């Protein structure tokens, strides 16, 4: 349930409008999805979402489309289409370890997935995540 | 270097400072001599996010959370706590010659130069790309490793 | 009270010492040269608890109990045994450069400040975030790290 | 159930009348409410309680809810009546760290309420702790 | 189980009349009762017994309840009559051992108290136990 | 210290000696170079156990048996092994500036002042509470805990 | 069965008379008792056997009845007469410890006695065994 | 001291040596100036068997094989290797002040004296709790622990 406050940090960074925050929050309370993956599209860039969120939830920062690698061994838990609406996907796979891309670390329902092996959460650019989603699973 | 855009003006472009705050900091470069980047942090002409984001925007940097973003054991070996605290920095993951350096101001060349000599004399080839984080975590990263 | 007022009289407020003990200690400091707290200790009036309970409260500082409270093992790198003994203090929890300067009597702000400056002489660039423990516990705490 | 005994430290530091201790202990068995929470009202002058309790468990002797802000999610975990006889509305709620500011960590029957997960204890004045409910539930 | 000859320190350290030992030893040998509690009152002071048992079993002699402070972890649940009749309270921890204060370490029904955890046993007089009865619960 | 009664004489009061044993042993130490506390038994008069229980008694302190009484490790490290061995003493309970010192001879001021200095180097400004033990038992205690 | 010829060394060392060896050795093969033990009192000072055992078998070199303490806790494990022929008294008891002290750990007829639990061999005289059994068996 | 029944002649009386070997040992006395005792074994004249029983006979000693008898690992440090091997001795179980010193000849007073001093200067209070054993096996045992 906690982070160093999504929405608010994004507003402080000049990344979202006050309206993006509030409408997104209404959608959060209405749907169960949380504010972060909701702020985006309501005014927030996903890049901005992810950058602030990385600071907010204990995440190690991830790479661009020239960096992060797809792997069904880990990704077979979150479908490219779930990954797409979520904004998140597992990264690579060791027999004893998975690295994971988050979107919104507060999205209670979704952040509960991804970890398809002992694993660690990370976060960065949506460009990377989209290409990753579509190849990973 | 680093160069690219000036920090002060970027703080403002982001909507995270007034040009008026940038100018007072510049007046500090005339009322003390620190450069715009030093004067902004010294004069408080940066919204916290302005500094961090503006530098991340100005030059190009990652957003991390140092509470968990790897405080590589080589990091306390690499840069000492006194220096680290004086310049608001602390190494994270060491990457061969390179470094993800936690830093309150990834552009401030003087702060970076004092850091550089320590990061040059120990561990790295400097090759530093400082990271963005809340000061609370910068404080904790420096504090916990020494 | 306790609040701002000197140790002895604030001991009255918490039931730690009586108006009579604090007045005699004031009579003593007239030649003793110390603070009410010092003449209360010097005159045999105070309990280690008397000090801790009212003085912390006095300044909005915490009263901490070292048997459990952050006996920070890296904090002696900022306020070493040398300094611990000098002021009857101990380095509870570091915060960047800051130190929870556990002291028998924070009422003596200038002593907290002398330690503050002395922290630089030993380690990081200070900033006291003071506290007090049972004077006896401050002593035991210091012993635990040397 | 380990402590330096509320009511005894209180008498020792001039914090209570003896009668506060004795009656509050009776009410503490007959109603089951915490001795301390009861002592304030039966003859204990507020801060006096918390300072004794902080000595009893080796706790930090804290400031008010200006800084010590409660957690409404955690507050709704307990019936506020459970939390009130307990002596605190919880702050935070980690698996190995609920933050609790009890009015009497000594009282063996009400002290046993609320902590579905163990607490790390800290403690200030009742003004703060009752405000802690006003600020959460 | 080995000891350093219960009864011998009592004589050798000037703690008893030899009569305490011989009568008591015979009762241990003939009745099956235990030499520790059998020895006292036979020409053996209670203090004298406990100092011998303390040394003989690798245990420690305890002073009055200014010293033998009960541990509420158990003492608030413990009936006052248990503190008295076993002459015993489980206390704190050290290494992995928890202290058992006892009226007689040879009297295994009392050493049994505590032993959910390893323990060193400690020793004291009937008055220590009556005072502990009076203060513990 | 405290000054103490003569050891032999306290043994007389306890029914453990004749005044004849006290004075004869005393005349022995006057030539031998040892202490009355040693010669009561070295002269072959009084039992070493009697002497051991009696010296603390001679001072108003208890008999404490070294194979029983807990040698709180801080205490033997507080007062070094060589220094302990030197006087026939072994450290126990600590508090504030206090140390219980279990001695074959509680009267032995060489310990107490050299101990004082050792305690002060560690951080305790002395307040030793001598207690007495059988020499062999503290020998074993000395052998076992530093 | 095997060793450095327990009991023959004694002749070499002047420990026994020639006649002691010849008789005891005939008795060894004839009866099953072994030369080591059989030789005692055949022209063999018992101690000399222990010098030989300490040398030919390597048992810890212990002492006579004025040295080694009897203890029925273990002595009752083996019959005094056979034990005397065997050459040992089992001594002392902890749940995890028994000592066995033996004059002839060659004894083809019964060498395996006693050491069938947390125990090991030590070395001492029949003089002790008989007296220690009579004192505790 | 020690006294009792002289080793030379008893080595012979036991039927384990000739009077001629006592004399050749004595020739070492004539060619070195030591005692019988010493030379009976040091010059290699009387049989080891003679010494095993005779040394044991002269003063009263046990005989034991060092390769097996519990060679108390701390005891080897009680007698530094060259002060151990030169005299054919090895420290076994310690008994408080006492040492079970296993030696080629516990009656060889020259070798024994060098060892005794070592067992007080380097060792315990000597108070030997001695035994006899060939030098070869003893030496192997000494080597195993130093």
Query: What residues in B contact A9, CB-CB < 8 Å?
Result: 49
- How, if at all, do strands A119-123 and A60-61 pair? parallel
- D121 near C CB under 8 A: no
Give the strand order in the sheet containing F89-95. Answer: F89-95, F98-103, F128-132
Instruction: Looking at the complex, report in whole angstroms how far the Cα of residue D47 sits from the nearest Cα belonging to chain C.
Output: 9
- Say if CB C145 and CB C118 are below 8 A apart: no
CB contact under 8 A, A58 and B67: yes
Interface test with C, best of F77, F78, F96, F118 (most C CBs within 10 A): F96
Alpha carbon separation from B96 to B99, D97, H63 (Å, rounded): 8, 38, 68
**C-alpha R_g of chain D:** 13
Ramachandran angles phi, psi of D107, nearest 5°: -75, 100
Please state whether the peptide bond connecting residue H127 to the residue before it is cis, i.e. omega within 30 degrees of 0.
Answer: no
Cα D106 to Cα F17: distance, rounded to the nearest angstrom: 54
Residue numbers in A near B56 (CB within 8 A): 51
- Which of G 40-59 lie inside 8 A of H, CB atoms? 47-48, 50-51, 54-59
State how far the Cα of H135 lies from the Cα of F98, in Å rounded to an integer: 54
- Residue C78 contacts residue C99 (beta carbons within 8 Å): yes
Q: Which of C94, C98, C123, C127 to mutate against chain B (most B CBs within 10 Å)?
A: C94
Tell me: cis bond preceding C120? Omega within 30 of 0 counts: no
Say yes or no: D63 contacts chain C, CB-CB below 8 A.
yes
**Encoded tokens for H16:** 């384990």
User: Are residues E1 and G92, on separate chains, in Cβ contact within 8 Å?
Assistant: no
- For residue E66, the surrounding DSSP H or E stretch is none
**In this structure, are residues G126 and G68 in contact, taking their beta carbons and an 8 Å threshold?**
no
G-chain CB neighbours of E4 within 8 Å are: none
Structural contact between residues B62 and B129, judged by C-beta atoms closer than 8 angstroms? yes
Q: Is E76's Cβ below 8 Å from some Cβ in D? A: yes
Give the distance between the most distant pair of CA atoms in chain B. Answer: 42
Contact H84, H91 (CB under 8 A): yes
Q: Where are the alpha helices (DSSP H) in D31-97?
A: 35-42, 47-57, 72-75, 80-86
Q: Which of C4, C143, C18 is nearest to C71 (CA)?
A: C143
Residue F99: phi and psi, rounded to 5, are -145, 125
The answer to whether A36 touches A53, Cβ cutoff 8 Å, is yes
CA diameter of chain H: 42
Question: How close does chain E come to G123, measured CA to CA in Å?
Answer: 21
Beta-sheet strands, E only, within B33-144? 89-95, 98-103
How many angstroms separate the CA atoms of C11 and C40, rounded? 10
Strand order in the sheet with D97-100: D91-94, D97-100, D119-121
- Tokens 């936690």 appear where? B102
User: Burial code of C75-105, b = ≥16 C-beta within 10 A, e = fewer?
Assistant: bbbbbbbebbeebbbbbbbbebbbbbbbbbb
What DSSP designation does H77 have? Answer: G
User: Resolution of this PDB entry, in A?
Assistant: 8.0
How many angstroms away from the CA of G65 is the closest CA of chain H? 16
What gap in Å lies between CA C66 and CA C64, rounded to an integer?
A: 6
Exposed (0-12), middle (13-18) or buried (19+): which is C30, by Cβ within 10 Å? exposed
Report residue G2 as tokens. Answer: 């095997």
Q: B65 and chain A: CB distance < 8 Å anywhere?
A: yes
| Chains sharing 3 or more CB pairs under 8 A with chain H | G
Chain E residues touching residue D1 (CB < 8 angstroms): 72-77
**D130: Cβ–Cβ under 8 A, 6 or more apart, which residues?**
none
Half-sphere exposure of H117 (CA within 13 A, CB side): 7
Kindly tell me the burial class for residue H111, based on how many C-beta atoms sit within 10 Å of its own C-beta (0-12, 13-18, 19 or more). buried
- Which of left, alpha, beta for E57 (phi over 0: left; psi -120 to 50: alpha)? alpha
Tokens of D59: 């706790």
Q: CA of E99: how far to CAs of A104, D2, F75, in Å?
A: 51, 15, 21
**CA-based R_g, chain G, Å:** 14
Quick check: B131 contacting A, CB < 8 Å? Answer: yes
Q: What is the dihedral of CA F86, F92, F96, F98, to 10 degrees?
A: -50
Experimental method: cryo-EM
Q: Which residues of E touch G92 (CB under 8 A)?
A: 2
Residue G122 CA to residue G102 CA, distance in Å, equals: 6
**Degrees to nearest 5, angle at CA H56 with H52 and H60:** 170
Smallest CA–CA distance, residue A124 to chain B, in Å, is 8
Q: Is G23 helix (H, G, I), strand (E, B) or coil?
A: helix
B contacts of C76 (beta carbons < 8 Å): none
Q: Are G99 and G122 in contact (CB under 8 A)?
A: yes
- Rounded CA-CA distance G99/C31 in Å is 75
Quote the CA–CA distance of H83 and H115 in Å, as a whole number. Answer: 6
Burial G59-89 (b: 16+ CB within 10 A, else e): bbbbbbbeebebbbbbbebbebeebbbbbbb
What count of residues does chain B have?
Answer: 146
Q: Do G13 and H133 touch (CB under 8 A)?
A: no
Any chains having at least 3 CB pairs less than 8 A from chain D are C, E
In chain C, residues with a C-beta closer than 8 Å to the C-beta of D59 are 65, 68
G136 Cβ neighbours under 8 A, 6+ residues apart:
G70, G71, G72, G75, G76
Distance CA B34, CA F45 (A): 87
Give the position of tokens 């000072």: G45
Q: Rounded CA gap, D69 and D64, in Å?
A: 9
Give yes or no for a contact between A86 and A112, defined as CB atoms under 8 angstroms apart.
no
Largest CA distance in chain E: 41
Q: Say whether the H–B interface has 3 or more Cβ pairs within 8 Å.
A: no
Query: Which distant-in-sequence residues (6+ apart) come within 8 Å of F85 by Cβ?
Result: F142
Measured at the alpha carbon of residue D119, what is the angle toward residues D113 and D122, in degrees to the nearest 5?
110
The enclosing H or E element of A106 equals: none
């Amino acid at each position: 349930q906690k982070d160093l406050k999504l929405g608010e940090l994004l507003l402080q960074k000049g990344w979202i409008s006050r309206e993006a925050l509030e409408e997104a929050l209404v959608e959060q309370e209405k749907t169960g999805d949380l504010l972060g993956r909701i702020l985006v599209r309501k005014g927030l860039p996903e890049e901005a979402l992810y950058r602030a969120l990385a600071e907010q939830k204990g995440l190690e920062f991830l790479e661009s489309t020239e960096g992060i690698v797809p792997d069904p061994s880990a990704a077979l838990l979150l479908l490219r289409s779930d990954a797409l609406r979520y904004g998140a996907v597992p990264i690579g796979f060791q027999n004893g370890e998975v690295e994971v891309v988050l979107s919104d670390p507060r999205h209670k329902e979704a952040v509960a997935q991804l970890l398809n092996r002992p694993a660690r959460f990370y976060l960065a650019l949506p460009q990377a995540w989209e290409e990753l989603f579509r190849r990973a699973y | 270097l680093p160069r690219a855009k000036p920090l002060g003006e970027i703080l403002v472009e982001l909507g995270l400072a007034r040009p008026e705050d940038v100018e007072e900091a510049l007046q500090k470069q005339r009322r003390g001599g620190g450069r715009l980047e030093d004067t902004l942090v010294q004069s408080g002409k940066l919204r916290p996010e302005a500094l961090a984001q503006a530098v991340a925007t100005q030059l190009g940097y990652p957003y991390v959370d140092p509470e968990e973003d790897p405080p590589d054991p080589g990091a306390p070996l690499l840069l000492p706590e006194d220096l680290c605290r004086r310049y608001g920095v602390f190494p994270h993951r060491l990457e061969g010659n390179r470094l993800v350096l936690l830093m309150k101001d990834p552009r401030n060349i003087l702060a970076l130069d004092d850091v550089r000599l320590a990061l040059k004399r120990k561990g790295l080839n400097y090759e530093v790309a400082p990271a963005v984080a809340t000061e609370a975590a910068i404080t904790k990263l420096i504090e916990r490793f020494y």
